Symmetry: D2
Subunit: 439 residues, 4 copies
């Protein structure tokens, strides 16, 4: 599945529809970033720039100009064709091919942006710009505006109003289109296959990073070259560290391993977490904590629908966790009083759900305490966890256990669709997958 | 193979030995860098900081203080132990464990660097600093120096002299120790296994990125998590693009595929290129270009020894390429006259060799036109290539052929050791490897 | 005359009246500036900050908050009372006294601005800020907005809209109130007395800077401590340089001296130019150029009124200059063709008029080629000049003559009032003035 | 009096003599600074750039190149001749005339500095640069060094060593040459005449700023257009504020007025303070505080010579002040015990002396607590003062009295020469001066 050219054009038009007459919106590409000396990390395009273009080059800027309520047009600044630079560093779209290829009206060389951008902004009332995201973009925009301001003698005038397009554009990204849902569905499936494979390959004596290796190969195999974030493989006590990425230890017989990994497929993130026994079997104590986390996840999946919120569902999860922890003797007291003192917090210290999309922690307004009412098209994770520190003042069999289980869902008219249910999470299904893989 | 804590201590001592009495050298960690929004690329430590510490955390600064010709000591700034931040983001070494763990005398909190660095520089004559590498580091240093200049009412004085330590440190990195050679040997072996595997797995209909996938899994399997640079898999006309990284096309029956890939193992880069037929069988035309490149590589491997240079060996490679290209009718004329007008350059447009180490294009002075005399301990690549553009004015059969073959070597007393010879490059050995797979 | 507390309060309300509900306008004080090492130039407050406060301290910010269409309030950030710093560097207003003294509702310490400004912008839709004027102000505003953007976990939201208040505020400054016109009148008078005195004191052998000294002492004498711009005293060929400030030569018998100087009185600029013979007698050649410049000025003074423009009046001046220059043989040809070829430009290369106010080159939209229709309340200069270079290809006797004559006017309902007519400009009146002063 | 061409050339050679072979020293002009909108304050050249050139234009850089122990040469970057810009804004020296006029070997356009500076630094071992003085200068130098670091392919190499020339140059400025002493002598005399005139013109009912006006007119009259710092005229309680510059109050019959003012003459600062009665007649209480300050100054003037220090002389002044204050009942107790607990500090809270030169608070190392041994050619102020706050707990008649008296001296072989003695400071000479101006 892919995003069509017609979809990119739709997005641009929807932004233009919300712009004032006499305005221009400026969307800048991400800079290339150094990894060490003259080598660079693999390029990752700014999510917003990508959302409106599908264009994966640096040194580019999209300018949408709304002259009035019917007339509008697009100008792309991008790198010029250069035979030498392309033999060396890769093909460039260039100016001639860009209009037909990206569906923009005009293309100009990026090297000319300071000579041209002020001419595009001249006489407009409003400039839309995401200030403070990239210093290089701010320099370009502020110089343009400064030429216009200081140029009353050449009959230049600057727009007096600057508006951040992020609130509106992030609100657009919060609501996935059917094409985006299908892409995220594929991201979820690829990611689920990677987690399935990790479970099938895991043996005591392997290192955490070996599972990372299996996961990334599976991502790549389906055309998702890069992870959407750094892969976490935390065995034993490392499971109690939420964003553990060192992945450097030998996995022990008798420990759990927690894998939090997600692919990036056509820009969109998958984000799954599975925790499972390194040896293919849960200890009593591991099963007991696992079942509480599973029940929390399974309940959240049943509950999530239009009209509730992350806050409301979180309240039910807390109740389940506190009840479960009291049965096991990890917490002591009355359930309702313990909920009122947030006594679960030493053991479950993060949110249940975040938005998901072109960024793994995707954009969009959550409301106070994530109280925003859910509607169809919203995509989010569900990631309950319990983490019992190695030195926690609790019964001893539970120490050093870190468990999180996470799926990705999209809210529909009647509930939600689970995008990552094709990788097992029921403990008996995990044991059957693994024990079968040993033979 | 690995770098011992005692080697890290020896490198620090060798820098201190070169420092003036009454001085301090400052070596800053790399910043974390954004990939998108709040997500970051996997951390890569500054190569020079790493060289002196083996420490893979950001927000750290190594300060070596030479008080005089016999007394010296080290202070590390690094992140404080923080239970919450570690639960969330990973273990930190902290201050208590750092002295014993890294072999430094004192450790202080990085968040205190602005209150403490000026006190360490106060009264010294010289500060050693790599200016312009990281903006955050320059701010810290300039701010410390400024407090000293402007604090005479508090009996503070600034060093009047700042010296770039990079020329000296890079000259040290140019000459590999036996430990380093053994690490680079392992990197070469791991990288070669990855290239072997790519050749064994390649079939028409697979995509370029599938070979990248095979290569990275093999890197990871041997404990080299990350490539030393972005992997190149250029099939067909994509082979004619030197740093082709899109790796997005279907590999066609009848095309060559060029793979440029290297692992990073304990900080050190492997760097191999192999070109081979996607279908396991060179066409006649592909074989004819391949043999010229291979002969260039083989002659280079024969010649590289102490007392010659990259420039000198390049001269021999140019002669082989020009002769070969005349024989095939790609160039027309007298060999010596064609060499004199650099007629090879449309087809071979890059250098033959670069230094190799903590960076794939490693530090160290090359001399004018890479004329520097080679000595034992230098590690370099040998990467001849020929690239015939799809529109080049040459016999039709050679158009769109891009071939590079690259090995990594270390100069020894009597020649060089080839670190990456365990992956085949002879055309018959390539064909035999691919059928057997 | 001065600007009353009620007037400053009126200006703030007029800005607030134009602001959107749910907004804040931020107006920052000028930074102190180094003259050399640890010494600073005498403080000059930002003109816009001054317009709204009358407050002459650095490290201060005015915040006007419009909660909705009826509720609004003001917060001033300014330097705290500090006994030690004040013993050393001067009295500070501080937080307790500021509300009553400046007519603001609240005052907070400037050192707390990063901890407080974001709290004031939180939940607002619009922030009004003059971006790019001061780097230190941009850093403060951007940090506040950044804390709000990234503080959604703390229920913080940033205004999505930033609007430059300069177009509106500069449009307000373009139209002077009666109190402002009375202040500018006094500035014009003080400045005229300084130019009168310079004419009276000038003798051959004195240096150009001596006249500068006379002028500045006169400004100071009436309570205008500082000039509104760097004084120009160009004798001989130095008169042909428009902003000649070196003022370093001996004034020669036979040369003209051109003096361009203006006081700054309660923030407002006077701006006069007079040119006169160093020896008290215009030669024939000097008098012939002078008369053309004078006729241009006197005619522009009649012409300027509501309904015309600087461009239209400039057209009339060009005609007078070209006709005059043809009569002397400085230009050759037909008058109308020469006008069409802008043949006057080697001799008159600057504008006739600029706005005048808290800045000598005051703010306000001119329109294309200064074509904006004039209305009552606008204040402007009228400054025709003719500058014949020492090597220009003309009758020899005109070489090295630089003459400018400049008055300040305010447009009224039926014409304009000349604010600087109390210093003479008719050549006979100049000669007569120089004769009476030398009898002492 | 002025600085000759030979002396500017001598200063340059003395710096070059201290430079390492294979090096270049860079000295940058001060930026123009805004006063308001498009108007600028009168240009003030950087003191160090001035010291080595006598050149009063912005957009200029002096480059001294020491090739080896015998060969050296100078390159000036400065503004190009531009007929239009000069008609508008003033004459420029330009490139053709600069060599002969300033005594430099070559002159280039400032607009070419980025294309040329790296070529001058190429292959050198050391660059001397005052880092952190001007941000515009640091950008230029860093950009040059960066082009050189990355230009090994074009056979460029950067100096690996940067040295701050300020310590050496400021040490040169600390020791005045005969030409400099003559110029400072003239500055002292101009400044003394201005203070004499203020005393002669002062009447009750005049404002503080009127005396400022008299002072500045007198500076200007002798060819010193600008003060070396902001003039202070503090009458009454305003005298108790050290750098009181508001100068806005009506001077009252019965008050003292304290005037701290100094001219700038050919770049060098005068710095005088005189305090005197607005009405021309010291009261008993004013005279009593005055005499202690005067004794402190006269004693300092007799003591300052080679081999003592500002710290040592300050100790004597503290003794005089404490004794005097005990005699009046302002301090109570034993003199030596009061000295030991620095009981003078509420009344005398600043230093006795600072260096004087191209900056009023001139450059040069003072040593800890100003303990550096004085030698011939050092120039310094002597400025004892007593300030009794309006609310101080002392006999009523001393409240609100602020008195400072300040002269400028140059240390000589056998003592010092007082550069500002031509303005009276004895209380009976002040009264007689004022009475004579009134008759
Ligand atoms: Ca997640
Ligand atoms: Ca290579
Ligand atoms: Ca004017
Ligand atoms: Ca002083
Ligand atoms: Cl471009
Ligand atoms: Cl820290
Ligand atoms: Cl404050
Ligand atoms: Cl220039």
């Amino acid at each position: 599945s892919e995003i069509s050219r017609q979809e990119f054009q739709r997005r641009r038009q929807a932004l233009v529809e919300q712009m004032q007459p006499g305005s221009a919106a400026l969307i800048f590409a991400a800079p290339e970033v150094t990894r060490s000396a003259d080598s660079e990390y693999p390029y990752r395009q700014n999510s917003d720039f990508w959302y409106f273009t599908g264009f994966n080059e640096p040194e580019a800027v999209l300018v949408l100009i709304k002259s009035d309520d019917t007339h509008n047009h697009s100008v792309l600044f991008n790198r010029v064709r250069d035979l030498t630079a392309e033999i060396w560093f890769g093909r460039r779209l260039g100016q001639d091919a860009a209009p037909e290829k990206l569906g923009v009206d005009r293309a100009l060389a990026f090297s000319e942006i300071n000579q041209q951008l002020y001419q595009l902004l001249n006489g407009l009332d409003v400039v839309y710009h995401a200030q403070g995201e990239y210093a290089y973009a701010d320099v370009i925009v502020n110089s343009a505006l400064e030429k216009l301001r200081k140029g009353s003698r050449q009959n230049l005038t600057a727009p007096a109003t600057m508006i951040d397009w992020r609130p509106v554009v992030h609100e657009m990204r919060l609501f996935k289109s059917p094409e985006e849902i299908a892409v995220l569905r594929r991201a979820g499936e690829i990611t689920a296959m990677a987690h399935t494979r990790a479970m099938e390959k895991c043996r005591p004596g392997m290192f955490e990073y070996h599972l990372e290796g299996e996961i990334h190969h599976e991502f790549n195999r389906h055309g998702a070259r890069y992870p959407s974030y750094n892969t976490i493989v935390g065995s034993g006590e490392n499971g109690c560290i939420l964003h553990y990425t060192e992945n450097e230890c030998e996995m022990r017989d008798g420990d759990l391993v927690l894998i939090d990994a997600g692919c990036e497929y056509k820009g969109y993130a998958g984000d799954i977490t599975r925790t499972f026994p390194v040896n293919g079997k849960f200890t009593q104590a591991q099963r007991e904590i696992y079942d509480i986390v599973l029940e929390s996840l399974e309940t959240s999946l049943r509950l999530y629908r239009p009209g509730t919120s992350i806050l409301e569902v979180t309240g039910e999860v807390v109740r389940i966790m506190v009840s479960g922890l009291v049965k096991l003797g990890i917490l002591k007291g009355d359930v309702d009083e313990l909920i009122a003192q947030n006594a679960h917090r030493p053991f479950f210290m993060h949110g249940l759900s975040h938005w998901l999309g072109l960024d793994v922690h995707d954009v969009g307004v959550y409301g106070q305490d994530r109280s925003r009412i859910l509607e169809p098209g919203m995509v989010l994770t569900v990631e309950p966890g319990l983490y019992i520190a190695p030195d926690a003042e609790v019964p001893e069999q539970y120490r050093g256990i870190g468990i999180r289980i996470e799926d990705d869902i999209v809210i529909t008219e009647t509930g939600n669709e689970n995008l990552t249910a094709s990788v097992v999470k029921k403990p008996e299904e995990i044991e059957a997958l693994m024990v079968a893989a040993r033979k």
